[PDB]
C-alpha cells in the first residue's frame, strides 16, 4: 500500500531521494513553439514551458500560443488544463482558452501577490459593477457573486462571447493560503477544497477540462491534479492498493514538465490521497470532519 511505502520513506527520511528519482525519470519532450522569439512575452518563467505535443492551441490565426498544457489521464478518464498565472498581456488569451475548451471551472492555487512579488495578473473582476472586456479576444467577464471562506473563495463569473453573444457560467475556486513552493496547512483543508471543486460539476466529463493554475502552473497545480487523479483511480476499482502515486505523477509529467516542485509537495500528495481514501472506501462522515477541521468559517 501507499501507507506502507509512506512509512517506509519517512523512517529512512528518503523523500528527497524519491523525489529526485522522479525528476531523473521524467519525460523530456520539445517545447519549440514556446521558445519561438515571438512568444517570449507570453511566458511567465523561462524554465516552465508547455510541450508542443500537449499544448493548448488558441483558435486564432494570428498566434495560437498560450503557456498551457492538456493533461489527459486515460486510465482515470479525467483531463485537466494546467497553465501559468496569466500575464497582463495574456488575460484575453486565457479566457479565450476557457471559452474554446468549454471549461466550467478555474482552480487558482496562488495569490496575486506572494512574498512581495506579483505572481499573476488580476485577470477576473473583483466588483460586480466593474466588468472586464478583453478587446483582443472579444470576450466580456462579469463577477456575478462571491462566497468568501477563511482560506478560499468561490466566485461565479459570467463569460460572454461578444461576437456571438453566448454566455457561460464559470466557477472560480481560489485557494488563498497555499504558499508557493509550500504545502497546504492540512490534508483536511486541501481535501475540503478539492471536494468543493468536485461538488460544483467543474470536473465532470460533460464539461471541458478544468483549468488549474498557480504562478507557474506546475507545483501546486501538479499537487492538486495528482491527488484528484489518484483518488479517482481508487474510486473506479475501490482498490487503494492498485494506485501507484509515483507512476501516476510520471504519467502526468508526460504532458507538462515539473509537476510537483518539492519533495515535501510529493510527501503531502501521499498524505492527501491516504486521508481521502477514507471517503472513497466508504466513510462519508469524513467529509464533514474535513470541513470542520478546515475552519472555513
Ligand atoms: O500531440 V498528441 O497525438 O500526444 O495529443
Ligand atoms: O505557481 V507554482 O511554483 O505552485 O507551479
Amino acid at each position: 500500500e501507499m501507507e506502507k511505502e509512506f512509512e517506509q520513506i519517512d523512517k529512512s527520511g528518503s523523500w528527497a531521494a524519491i523525489y529526485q528519482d522522479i525528476r531523473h525519470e521524467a519525460s523530456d519532450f520539445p517545447c519549440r513553439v514556446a521558445k519561438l522569439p515571438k512568444n517570449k512575452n507570453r511566458n511567465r518563467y523561462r524554465d516552465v514551458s508547455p510541450f508542443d505535443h500537449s499544448r493548448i492551441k488558441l483558435h486564432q490565426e494570428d498566434n495560437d500560443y498560450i503557456n498551457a498544457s492538456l493533461i489527459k489521464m486515460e486510465e482515470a478518464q479525467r483531463s485537466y488544463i494546467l497553465t501559468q498565472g496569466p500575464l497582463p498581456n495574456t488575460c484575453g488569451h486565457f479566457w479565450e482558452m476557457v471559452w474554446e475548451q468549454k471549461s466550467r471551472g478555474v482552480v487558482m492555487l496562488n495569490r496575486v501577490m506572494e512574498k512581495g512579488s506579483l505572481k499573476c495578473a488580476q485577470y477576473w473582476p473583483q466588483k460586480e459593477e466593474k466588468e472586464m472586456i478583453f478587446e483582443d479576444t472579444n470576450l466580456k467577464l462579469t463577477l456575478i457573486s462571491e462566497d468568501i471562506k477563511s482560506y478560499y473563495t468561490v466566485r461565479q463569473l459570467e463569460l460572454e462571447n461578444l461576437t456571438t453573444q453566448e454566455t457561460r457560467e464559470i466557477l472560480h475556486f481560489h485557494y488563498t493560503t497555499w504558499p508557493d513552493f509550500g504545502v497546504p496547512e492540512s490534508a483536511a483543508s486541501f481535501l475540503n477544497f478539492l471536494f468543493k471543486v468536485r461538488e460544483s460539476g467543474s470536473l465532470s466529463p460533460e464539461h471541458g477540462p478544468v483549468v488549474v493554475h498557480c504562478s507557474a502552473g506546475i507545483g501546486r497545480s501538479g499537487t492538486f491534479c495528482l491527488a484528484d487523479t489518484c483518488l479517482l483511480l481508487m474510486d473506479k476499482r475501490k482498490d487503494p492498493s492498485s494506485v501507484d502515486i509515483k507512476k501516476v505523477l510520471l504519467e502526468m509529467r508526460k504532458f507538462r514538465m515539473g509537476l510537483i516542485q518539492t519533495a515535501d509537495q510529493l510527501r503531502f500528495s501521499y498524505l492527501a490521497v491516504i486521508e481521502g481514501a477514507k471517503f472513497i472506501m466508504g466513510d462519508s462522515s469524513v467529509q464533514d470532519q474535513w470541513k470542520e477541521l478546515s475552519h472555513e468559517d
Side-chain angles (χ1 to χ4, degrees), residues 1-3 5-71 73-114 116-297:
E1 222 187 329
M2 49 179 56
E3 212 163 4
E5 186 193 2
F6 184 90
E7 285 158 14
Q8 194 160 31
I9 302 154
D10 258 18
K11 177 272 317 309
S12 87
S14 49
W15 282 107
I18 298 293
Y19 175 64
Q20 205 62 213
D21 289 350
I22 298 308
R23 300 213 317 110
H24 183 271
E25 301 159 32
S27 305
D28 191 6
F29 298 110
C31 312
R32 297 323 112 203
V33 179
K35 291 300 190 176
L36 292 174
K38 65 163 162 183
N39 288 326
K40 213 212 181 325
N41 72 359
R42 300 185 172 209
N43 292 313
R44 179 169 290 277
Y45 297 106
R46 207 161 308 248
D47 299 343
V48 181
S49 294
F51 302 137
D52 296 319
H53 82 84
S54 56
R55 63 174 193 106
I56 302 286
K57 298 177 167 90
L58 306 168
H59 304 172
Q60 51 161 287
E61 281 134 22
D62 189 73
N63 185 341
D64 70 14
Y65 178 73
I66 181 169
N67 192 318
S69 301
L70 173 68
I71 303 206
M73 298 306 284
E74 197 191 352
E75 187 190 5
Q77 277 296 291
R78 187 156 285 167
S79 292
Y80 320 83
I81 292 171
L82 272 56
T83 189
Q84 72 186 11
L87 293 159
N89 61 311
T90 70
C91 293
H93 310 151
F94 174 91
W95 287 112
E96 174 190 359
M97 172 178 65
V98 169
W99 186 267
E100 295 162 351
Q101 302 305 132
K102 296 168 202 307
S103 313
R104 159 154 181 80
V106 170
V107 179
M108 164 166 193
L109 298 170
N110 67 288
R111 281 179 295 114
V112 159
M113 179 168 285
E114 301 180 320
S117 296
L118 294 179
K119 305 304 278 300
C120 184
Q122 186 52 241
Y123 64 90
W124 75 95
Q126 302 173 282
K127 286 178 181 181
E128 284 85 341
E129 68 275 13
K130 278 238 171 261
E131 79 278 1
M132 290 173 80
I133 294 181
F134 305 97
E135 254 156 39
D136 66 336
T137 53
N138 211 36
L139 288 162
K140 185 200 218 162
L141 184 65
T142 308
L143 175 63
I144 295 314
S145 74
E146 232 168 68
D147 183 11
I148 304 189
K149 310 281 172 193
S150 73
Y151 70 102
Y152 72 93
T153 298
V154 184
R155 310 187 180 78
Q156 188 188 347
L157 308 162
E158 177 168 303
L159 181 63
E160 186 187 334
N161 182 338
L162 288 176
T163 302
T164 68
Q165 300 221 131
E166 321 151 71
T167 71
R168 300 196 179 137
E169 175 190 11
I170 310 289
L171 301 177
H172 195 247
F173 300 87
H174 186 184
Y175 206 116
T176 61
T177 54
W178 192 340
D180 203 357
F181 283 80
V183 293
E185 296 201 74
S186 61
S189 278
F190 170 82
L191 297 167
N192 184 64
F193 175 88
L194 168 63
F195 277 63
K196 199 83 164 138
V197 176
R198 282 173 164 220
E199 290 188 350
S200 73
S202 291
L203 289 172
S204 80
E206 70 257 47
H207 300 297
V210 71
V211 176
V212 182
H213 84 83
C214 38
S215 193
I218 55 171
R220 294 167 283 181
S221 300
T223 306
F224 175 89
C225 294
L226 177 67
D228 181 57
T229 288
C230 287
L231 289 175
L232 178 59
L233 288 164
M234 185 174 317
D235 216 1
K236 208 271 174 53
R237 270 102 88 188
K238 299 295 194 182
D239 191 359
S241 275
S242 74
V243 174
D244 188 334
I245 304 173
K246 307 209 274 333
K247 286 204 175 39
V248 172
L249 176 54
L250 281 166
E251 179 64 31
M252 295 191 148
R253 270 181 183 231
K254 307 177 172 175
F255 303 91
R256 190 171 173 85
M257 59 172 62
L259 301 185
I260 296 195
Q261 270 174 309
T262 72
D264 200 48
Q265 287 175 352
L266 180 63
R267 174 180 201 273
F268 181 86
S269 292
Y270 275 73
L271 283 176
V273 171
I274 292 161
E275 174 67 15
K278 294 179 193 167
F279 180 88
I280 296 324
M281 290 318 272
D283 181 14
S284 283
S285 82
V286 86
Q287 169 167 16
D288 292 322
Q289 291 166 51
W290 300 334
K291 177 199 231 203
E292 294 296 276
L293 285 155
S294 87
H295 301 122
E296 37 173 54
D297 280 13

